[PDB]
Design a protein around this ligand. Sequence first.
Ligand SMILES: OC[C@H]1O[C@H](OC[C@H]2O[C@H](O[C@H]3[C@H](O)[C@@H](O)[C@@H](O[C@H]4[C@H](O)[C@@H](O)[C@@H](OC[C@H]5O[C@H](O[C@H]6[C@H](O)[C@@H](O)[C@@H](O)O[C@@H]6CO)[C@H](O)[C@@H](O)[C@@H]5O)O[C@@H]4CO)O[C@@H]3CO)[C@H](O)[C@@H](O)[C@@H]2O)[C@H](O)[C@@H](O)[C@@H]1O
Ligand SMILES: [Ca+2]
Ligand SMILES: [Ca+2]
Ligand SMILES: [Ca+2]
Length: 637
Amino acid sequence: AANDNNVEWNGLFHDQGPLFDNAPEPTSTQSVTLKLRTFKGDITSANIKYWDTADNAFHWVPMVWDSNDPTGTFDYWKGTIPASPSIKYYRFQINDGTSTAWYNGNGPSSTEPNADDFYIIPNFKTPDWLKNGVMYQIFPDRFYNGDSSNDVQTGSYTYNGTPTEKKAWGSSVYADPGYDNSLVFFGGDLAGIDQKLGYIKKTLGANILYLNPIFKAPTNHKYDTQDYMAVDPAFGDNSTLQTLINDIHSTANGPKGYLILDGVFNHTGDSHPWFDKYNNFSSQGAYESQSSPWYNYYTFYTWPDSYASFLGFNSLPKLNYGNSGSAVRGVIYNNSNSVAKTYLNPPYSVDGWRLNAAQYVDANGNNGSDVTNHQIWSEFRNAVKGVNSNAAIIGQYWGNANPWTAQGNQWDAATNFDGFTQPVSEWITGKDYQNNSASISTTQFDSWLRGTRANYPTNVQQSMMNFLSNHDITRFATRSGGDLWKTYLALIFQMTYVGTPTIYYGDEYGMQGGADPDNRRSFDWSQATPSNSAVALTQKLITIRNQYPALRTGSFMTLITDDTNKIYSYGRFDNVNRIAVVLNNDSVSHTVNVPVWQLSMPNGSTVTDKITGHSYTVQNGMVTVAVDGHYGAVLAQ
Ligand SMILES: OC[C@H]1O[C@H](OC[C@H]2O[C@H](O[C@H]3[C@H](O)[C@@H](O)[C@@H](O[C@H]4[C@H](O)[C@@H](O)[C@@H](OC[C@H]5O[C@H](O[C@H]6[C@H](O)[C@@H](O)[C@@H](O)O[C@@H]6CO)[C@H](O)[C@@H](O)[C@@H]5O)O[C@@H]4CO)O[C@@H]3CO)[C@H](O)[C@@H](O)[C@@H]2O)[C@H](O)[C@@H](O)[C@@H]1O
Ligand SMILES: [Ca+2]
Ligand SMILES: [Ca+2]
Ligand SMILES: [Ca+2]
């Protein structure tokens, strides 16, 4: 490269990883110094062009030459953006003589982009344990029956005109004739989860647990809350919860863990004392008397049998959050003994909340996705962070969650359906997460992944809940048609991508299952050992990610997108480690020349595939490795 009226795109690069941004999570007064990489001597000038919400205008900040990388192949230019609490967006204008190129969240462009700019959100920090950990989601009733005395028995109670049923372990999740799918209980409880912490934290290595609802409710999924202040008797009691949390936080049964609970705050069950539709409790619920102490907690259109609810589900009356200072905002997150604060405070001290139906939370029965909804989550974040600045907040959302994250005042991240689950599914299994046929090439996969990452600030990207499957969609192994290797590949990608790897109980061994409720089968424990090849791989991959900070908070650079041979390679790197991941999708084995020079891996240095143990030597900026179909190598140094 040289000063020849031409900017060479191949040498350009910038993202907010350690080597290019000294303040990825800036405080309200923090200056942000950035570095732009280019081929050595390729440009004549560079500017950071940023939009400031403070004064509704663009601002140009020149860059100055800073240095060359260890291989002497690139230049590093640096610039500093003035500090202030205002949100800012930036892109780069790179010039060489009369030639100009632009660069933003989606890479290089010949024309100045109008979107996908990078983010600078002052005073927005997500928990670092979330960025660096591995999550394991458990649907309580289906994991492990640690206490048989609390098991819900068949016919114990009837709800919606149907009795409950107890199911034998390993039998179909579908209710037998006469029962309802939502009232089927296998017996899984909190004692069981505690007893299997060694399997989760030691055998596998995950250190973050995310549990579906566990508070008093009549259903087996428990999203129809009856009492937020107590564990459902079938799962145990509050003391059992205190012990489980203590055991999760313990280091005696594996590494220190973290607990994230499911917060169902958009609505309650119709059997909740506040509502009490079936007249089961003393007090006069909102449904029973217009003179109820909790009448304002809900929204009726025609009292008492016509009220706002979750998507028309009668058993799910919608909570009216009213305006700031309301009684509902008090019981949920403003009061000293609010639900959110209660569990974040001792003797519980949980580590976070997953926000159920977070997009609908509103006042007066509104559908959410509006100013009020965003205002409520702003107050919620302020409260939660006040109690514990390291308490996680992850909202449920299926599309682009930018509105609840990019403002830096609401959620730390979201259920990554749009930026992880869907693309991963369509690339590997060739189905959408609902199991309808839908496929994408490797280049489209890389593009999808980058475009969605660009929807979020860097810390949010690193905090996204990335799961292959969950309780509302079909199982990955079912979408894969039982092809376990597809799970192998998915795991390798997952454990090396941006965002929190999240294992939905069972996926580690290849558990199958169709749509709800078949996606909530009882866990087959005879499969929980290295004998299951997927379990053995999972254990190894978690150890690798726990080992390299670069895989959790390092930069991400696309290296190879080959649709002919189905090869996808990308680098994850920071100031210490450089990692080139090489994946092979749906094709026979291939020998790949990995361009590690793009990662500045020096010629003559050695790299080691952390999966196989094979070592290689960098020659002429390359590493030549063989990767079989539906597998991958993790070349690191
Ligand atoms: O009253 C008649 C009827 O009553 C009973 O229930 C019938 C319904 O039961 C089941 O649905 C349950 C579900 O099993 C529960 O888990 C619970 O659902 C909650 C989710 O689990 C949470 O993640 C959260 O989801 C909110 C999201 O909801 C929507 O997403 C849906 C997708 O669109 C869809 O493709 C698929 O993936 O499902 C999801 C979730 O349902 C919404 O679009 C999205 O924006 C939002 O984020 O909250 C949920 C509610 O708390 O409750 C459900 C309702 O009770 C069956 O799955 C359902 O088919 C059935 O209608 C009796 O069981 C039944 O016999 C009787 O006829
Ligand atoms: Ca040039
Ligand atoms: Ca039990
Ligand atoms: Ca009553």
